[PDB]
Design a binder for this molecule. Structure first.
Ligand SMILES: Nc1nc2sc(CCCCc3ccc(C(=O)N[C@@H](CCC(=O)O)C(=O)O)o3)cc2c(=O)[nH]1
Ligand SMILES: NCC(=O)N[C@@H]1O[C@H](COP(=O)([O-])[O-])[C@@H](O)[C@H]1O
Ligand code: NA
Length: 200
């Protein structure tokens, strides 16, 4: 399976995905890395890995459709099979999500369905949970509500901040994102006919 990784910043999940997909038994290959923001560190990690990069500045498009369309163009250029959202912080338009239904994965730093949205760690700390975690799911049109592929629980420790909680959660993210990509790339897991996870 040919994989595009979309990023908005540091790219630690990108790097974990790079590492896993270079294992001999990997069913995924990362053929293109796309950032909506230049100068972000994830672009350096891709270039150190020999992976082509493209920056598509969402700020230069009238609307989301033209912007997504620009992304879709690059995906087609690289004959992409699978899209990984790895710290990509833009919401994608309906038609783009539909076109890639069952082919696009996102990592979210909570145990969905808890703490959807952009500040999961803040929400988890304000709520006072002692267990949080992270989720890889298929991207559906309903944000952070697509079908769940893998999750891993992570303890919240007393005194945790966004800084320390997200550091601990990311170690789990770097485990289940590569595992989830391999499940999809190998065809072991698909978005089933009925839209629920299908294990083959
Ligand atoms: N339809 C659909 N699209 C998508 S994209 C994705 C990948 C992860 C979603 C991240 C997210 C959560 C909330 C926001 C948000 O408010 N972002 C602002 C800009 C934020 C900034 O600048 O940092 C915007 O979108 O302008 O971002 C998952 C997903 C999905 O599950 N469904
Ligand atoms: N709503 C999506 C969201 O909160 N994404 C989160 O952004 C970080 C990106 O880190 P990275 O750039 O080092 O992979 C990750 O922690 C991921 O869970
Ligand atoms: Na999708």
């Amino acid at each position: 399976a040919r994989v595009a990784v979309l990023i908005s910043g540091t790219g630690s999940n990108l790097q974990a995905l790079i590492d896993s997909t270079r294992e001999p038994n990997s069913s995924a290959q990362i053929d293109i890395v796309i950032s909506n923001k230049a100068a972000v560190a994830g672009l350096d990690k891709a270039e150190r890995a020999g992976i082509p990069t493209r920056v598509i500045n969402h700020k230069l498009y009238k609307n989301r459709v033209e912007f997504d369309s620009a992304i879709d163009l690059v995906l087609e250029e690289f004959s992409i099979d699978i899209v990984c959202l790895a710290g990509f912080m833009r919401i994608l338009s309906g038609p783009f999500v539909q076109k890639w239904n069952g082919k696009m994965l996102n990592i979210h730093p909570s145990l969905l369905p808890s703490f959807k949205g952009s500040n999961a760690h803040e929400q988890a700390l304000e709520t006072g949970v002692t267990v949080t975690g992270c989720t890889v799911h298929f991207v559906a049109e309903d944000v952070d509500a697509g079908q769940i592929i893998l999750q891993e629980a992570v303890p919240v420790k007393r005194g945790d901040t966004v800084a320390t909680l997200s550091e601990r959660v990311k170690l789990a993210e770097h485990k289940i994102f590569p595992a989830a990509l391999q499940l999809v790339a190998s065809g072991t897991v698909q978005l089933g006919e009925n839209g629920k996870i299908c294990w083959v």
